[model samples]
Target chain A: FQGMIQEIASILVQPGREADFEAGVAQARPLFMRARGCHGVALHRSIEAPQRYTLVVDWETVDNHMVDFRQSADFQEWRKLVGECFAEPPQVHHEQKVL
Target chain B: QGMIQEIASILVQPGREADFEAGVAQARPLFMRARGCHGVALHRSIEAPQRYTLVVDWETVDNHMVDFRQSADFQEWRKLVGECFAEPPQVHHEQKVL
Candidate 1:
């Protein structure tokens, strides 16, 4: 119904735990896909930074992510699934398509 | 989504967001015409307005790091949009894994 809002999570996994981290993300994919207003989720790994990865989620609006998703139990479910693999807290932000 | 991606994170001069976007739109042809560039999109930070990321799909790293950067089009492309830079853009590559 509205233009997609991309929620970008720039994350770093614990050293030597990348395989575990990738598996966790694969297991957690459906959690995001089923969330209201979520279009889908995709993960990108940095070519230069071995530990760095980006989780890109498409949502219908900022509210769908900040309120609908973040405020739900699913958010915690997501964190539980992959949080242990994190080296540190992720730097997350939302961006809008301009071109 | 199938190809490698270049994330060029840029910061424009404060209050020049609109002009910066316009610069990219007008300069698109210059960069797109280069070999190996499949497509491009510019996204602005919703929380930090002046920050933007130009996501470009390329066939290979050298297509961007070598071929494009060494060409005249790169010079003209910057001439078109580099004026809006508050600082040098950070460029990196990523590939989808999931």
Candidate 2:
């Protein structure tokens, strides 16, 4: 598969809710891992600020994520499991390797 | 040589994306030459056009915070790439868990 885009979901959990948020992510991980065009997924917690987490997902292309995954039922399941723990709407973006 | 991740979020000056990318490419070699630096990857934000994120993997945290950040190459890196920034870059480190 071509490595054209990286999907980043920068999330901030409500203060004092880190544990709850992490649990939600653990449950929601499978929803994305099974998606087509998803190569892998990793959850990273901020060292400086514990409440902050960044979910990094490698994708074959931008359309694979922006169109297929977002429109799929798996995405709705993902949101149902993890969306409520968000302190605010997550910052989502797609980027390509430059270096 | 344990793996460490460095996340750098940079905000570039408005309307200067192309110039900023050129500067980043010029400064790229400085990072690769640093001790214990394994690799680096740069990414441009889709939601915010002026934002970029740099992901760097290092052999050790000290190789980045002490050795690289304090070296002359760092100064040269800043000289080549810093002026294009809207503000100082926000950086932090993390370890893999899941």
Candidate 3:
């Protein structure tokens, strides 16, 4: 089995746009499953800002995520679904062993 | 009702730690360039050295996928340091419920 690394990130959506955001996330779910390196992807909504959301995507490698996401049709669908919800943009970060 | 999201991660092997760190560093600039991206932070398990976590804040989910994905920076990001992980990472999305 290929070992996987975790991708963690958060995003906020326009107020009252929660439903649209949720739908977009749901649409992206199946696409994630089909990706070559994708292990899983999840979407979260923020309590402070109901319109806000967080997404975590798992992949075999950073490279796998990059290649698969960029080349996939699902990515385009994801872009279309959630494209309008941004107040600003998305911040992304990665995890690594310290010791 | 905006909530804070957290992602928890555990590495499979000891030696891959540096590779993981390098991957994070490589993606740092691309992430910062994302439209909804607010800020990002990294942490390692004090007890379990093999584990790590990343925290990212964004302005909105829509902006994240749309702007970030479409941006030329993300494309460059993919090219720069995309192949660092051993396998697909485990992902979890969360909101501050309490």
Candidate 4:
């Protein structure tokens, strides 16, 4: 899982809604905990806006993230609970280290 | 399922340190209410005044988002603290090892 894959997913939320967003987060925790290939997830807020958020997830492989985890029922459930909070579609990045 | 960490770097306006501190104090408990929140701490940039780093520890990335975007406390947090920033802060996340 270490060298086989690298990626990060971020969902930006609206301004001034941090607590509601976090409540939605609390609701989605079980789903994350239940998902496969879920090495871990981290929740973050932009220090400036406080409302802007970034959720970084790590997986064993890109396939694990895109194909497996994305297709899971838990993912759907997670989306239902917190998807509306996003200001735009969630951004998923496949990490590439150039240096 | 595993541990996660988020790092935030921000610069507050000059002479606003006390205001920032007061705001953070108001928001800190709200952050602690998060379930995935393992811990969160504040630090001052040693070489610069009004520069700070907030390190948040979490159980999962999704948990962080859920808290920041969907929680009610976050709204209160923003009202108390948003004005101190010189500009939008850079927020980054990483896996915690060890």
Candidate 5:
């Protein structure tokens, strides 16, 4: 996090389908880890809402995520792995330390 | 040990970026002084400069909700940074799932 920007992806799985969603993530985790410029990956489920999840992953830069990952076949595989569990598509953003 | 990352999504008053960041630095010790706090960090948005995320890692949810939030230091910390806030922060708790 100190040197890499973090990707914050807000994910909401279909109600009562959390297990399926987490399973998808577990299966897809390696795709990110082995991808170029990805430092690490983590998944955090919301304490207040059971179906809500957040995917926090470190990237070398925005281009690494947007141009590299998203444009690759891995992105398609990622979608197929978990697409059906989503109540809606993930809202993703990138953030990093400024101070 | 339990781990809970508190994500505080914050928006500062326009043009007060430097002031808000400095306020966070000034208030840093208030958080570290707490018994259960692991660390704190501020992440600024690349797409939206006005938005920032205040992230804190704690030993447990109780450590955050009671030990820190209920302390006088909490108010004092807020006082140092509150003036730059555009609105109340949107706070959420999350545990490591991976």
Candidate 6:
């Protein structure tokens, strides 16, 4: 109730496709920023695993992401811009800050 | 170049989510007192209830590895939160590339 929720997407890009995926994320960054509940977004590359990326997005609430953003055209556009790079569907989870 | 980011995914023992979270909260002060520690955030997994991800930011990586990790605070932190872990936390540091 007090802390913002973070949407963590553990993305596994196709092997050797990391550069392409990074570019895709750069292109799709604006789409997420424009969404209603979006507070900020950051894309982190995994050190141990080159193909693994973590997409951290802060939202006002879980519903703003699950219902509002997911059901909107922005979501489609975002996927269209970056979906092809995925080796598998991203593992996504919503987390509330505890400490 | 500017910020040091961390992703520490901790797996708690089955049905120990509440207990582990309380431990984390109790250990918060230890982290907050570390030198160069900017801030921290914890997130719970929807798919895996026992899994929690701890996101931390620091002024520099050395502040974490050399200063904090090697200090007594780290040991106490482990004593408080480490006991509940199912396995060692998967920790990795990264620089902001985008």
> How high is the CA lDDT of each candidate model?
0.92, 0.84, 0.63, 0.68, 0.90, 0.85
Lowest lDDT sum, 10 consecutive residues, model 2 chain B, at B89-98
Superior by TM-score: candidate 3 or candidate 4: 3
Per TM-score, the best of the predicted structures is: 1
Off by over 4 Å in 5: A1-3
Q: Which model is ahead, 2 or 3, in terms of DockQ?
A: 2
DockQ of 6: 0.64
Cα error, residue A81 of model 5, in Å, equals 0.4
Which stretch of 10 consecutive residues in model 4 chain A shows the poorest summed lDDT?
A1-10
Clashes, model 4? 24
Interface DockQ per candidate:
0.94, 0.63, 0.13, 0.03, 0.79, 0.64
Residue-wise lDDT of candidate 5 within B70-93, one digit each (tens)?
A: 899989988999989999999988
Once fitted onto the true fold, the runs of candidate 3 whose alpha carbons sit more than 4 angstroms away are: A96-99, B1-98
Q: What is the lDDT of candidate 2?
A: 0.84
**Model 2: runs farther than 4 Å from truth?**
A1-3, A15-20
lDDT by residue (A1-99, candidate 2, tens digit) is 245578988889988877887788888888877888888888888777778888889888888898999999999988888777889998888877766
What shift in Å separates residue A56 of candidate 2 from its native position after superposition? Answer: 1.1
Q: Compute the lDDT for candidate 3.
A: 0.63
**lDDT (Cα, tens digit) per residue for candidate 3, span A1-99:** 235565555677777777777777776688778888887787766544566676767777766667767687877887788879777678665444231
Q: 3 or 6: which has the higher TM-score?
A: 6
Q: Model 6 - which docking category?
A: medium
Per-residue lDDT of model 5, residues A1-99, tens digit only: 447898999999999889998999999999999877999999999998879999998999889999999899999999999999999988999999765
Candidate 2 clashes: the total is: 0
Best by lDDT: 1
Candidate 3 per-residue C-alpha lDDT over B27-96 given as tens digits, one digit per residue, 9 for 90 to 100: 7877777776766676664345665666666665545556765888866764653454445445443563
- Candidate 5, residue A94: the lDDT equals 93
Ranking by DockQ: 1, 5, 6, 2, 3, 4
lDDT of 4 by residue, B3-92 (tens): 766776778999887788778877778888877887776656424657776778888767777756688776787788789999987776
Please list the Cα RMSD from the true structure of every candidate, rounded to 1 decimal place: 1.6, 2.8, 14.6, 13.5, 1.8, 2.6
Kindly give the stretch of ten consecutive residues in candidate 6 chain B with the minimal lDDT sum. B40-49
User: Docking quality tier of candidate 3?
Assistant: incorrect
For model 1, residues A1-99, the per-residue Cα lDDT tens digits are 248899999999999989999999999999999999999899999999979999999999989999999888998999999999999999999998888
